[PDB]
Design a protein around this ligand. Structure first.
Ligand SMILES: *[C@@H]1O[C@H](CO)[C@@H](O[C@@H]2O[C@H](CO)[C@@H](O[C@@H]3O[C@H](CO)[C@@H](O)[C@H](O)[C@@H]3O)[C@H](O)[C@H]2NC(C)=O)[C@H](O)[C@H]1NC(C)=O
Ligand SMILES: *[C@@H]1O[C@H](CO)[C@@H](O[C@@H]2O[C@H](CO)[C@@H](O)[C@H](O)[C@H]2NC(C)=O)[C@H](O)[C@H]1NC(C)=O
Lengths: 147, 49, 49
């Protein structure tokens, strides 16, 4: 739970993701697999945790150094957290960086970590629309059709 | 062919596929040579795999 | 990339390894990743090009 998040005057966290912390003083290795039975292209969101200092790293994940790795059929990258002092934004000294990838049907994503991983609580299955980019306006919505 | 049936005889991922297609789409002089000898370069390493 | 660490030890005799290619223009370092994944062409592991 993050004190930066405020929903109805209560601390909370992102709905689509999950923050994982060690239980009973230990952080065992994790391994997750998902098969794409939705027949549509899925989008998965995950992030890494950069702690404020080595003390908070040891308090949260019980390890001075940790890594997270994501592998797929077409996308593979190895991630390394950085522990350093950073400017304070929204009463949070540390920062967390998010990453995304697109999976075709018939592909399996693998998550392996010993710490500093923000787990994907929810995933999104979407269809491909080719165009119609984002626009930026404050005008009121109306129920009329214009080409 | 629109659907190539022999892409990779060992499965894997190719880095910058479209860039290499654009690079190899037109050539003037194209030559194949042995960059490393098979027997001389790896005496202590098995190469028959 | 071996599918399991046992095949990695059987083939290359090192639990960990590094691949590094360096030039005056392009330089990069590669680290093998060992993980299970679904079979394509009757091979769990893949090789990255
Ligand atoms: C080049 O492309 C040809 C396609 O014409 C490849 O032949 C195909 O090889 C696959 C892999 O062995 C075969 O799939 C398997 O077939 C067996 C029956 O033999 C079946 O029990 C398995 O469930 C699986 O489907 C496929 O049948 C075969 N097709 C033909 C027409 O021979 C060939 O392997 C490729 N060569 C390469 C990639 O070097
Ligand atoms: C949990 O993950 C860690 C990190 O990879 C594993 O620690 C490594 O284990 C291998 C094999 O025993 C060693 O060669 C490495 O030196 C270890 N690295 C570190 C930093 O300790 C650990 O073995 C994993 N545990 C389980 C039960 O899978």
């Amino acid at each position: 739970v993050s004190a930066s998040c405020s929903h109805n005057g209560e601390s909370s966290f992102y709905k689509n993701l999950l923050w994982l912390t060690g239980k009973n003083g230990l952080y065992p290795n994790l391994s997750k697999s998902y098969a794409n039975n939705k027949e549509k292209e899925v989008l998965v969101l995950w992030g890494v945790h950069h702690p404020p200092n080595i003390g908070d790293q040891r308090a949260l994940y019980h390890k001075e150094n940790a890594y997270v790795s994501v592998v797929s059929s077409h996308y593979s990258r190895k991630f390394t957290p950085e522990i350093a002092k950073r400017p304070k934004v929204r009463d949070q000294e540390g920062r967390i960086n998010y990453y995304w990838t697109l999976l075709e049907p018939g592909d399996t994503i693998i998550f392996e970590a010993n710490g500093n991983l923000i787990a994907p609580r929810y995933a999104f299955a979407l269809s491909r629309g080719f165009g119609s980019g984002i626009i930026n306006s404050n005008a009121p919505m109306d129920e009329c059709d214009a080409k | 062919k629109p659907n190539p049936e022999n892409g990779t005889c060992y499965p894997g991922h190719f880095a910058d596929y479209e860039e290499l297609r654009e690079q190899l789409s037109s050539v003037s002089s194209f030559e194949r040579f042995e960059i490393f000898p098979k027997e001389s370069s790896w005496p202590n390493h098995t190469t028959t795999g």
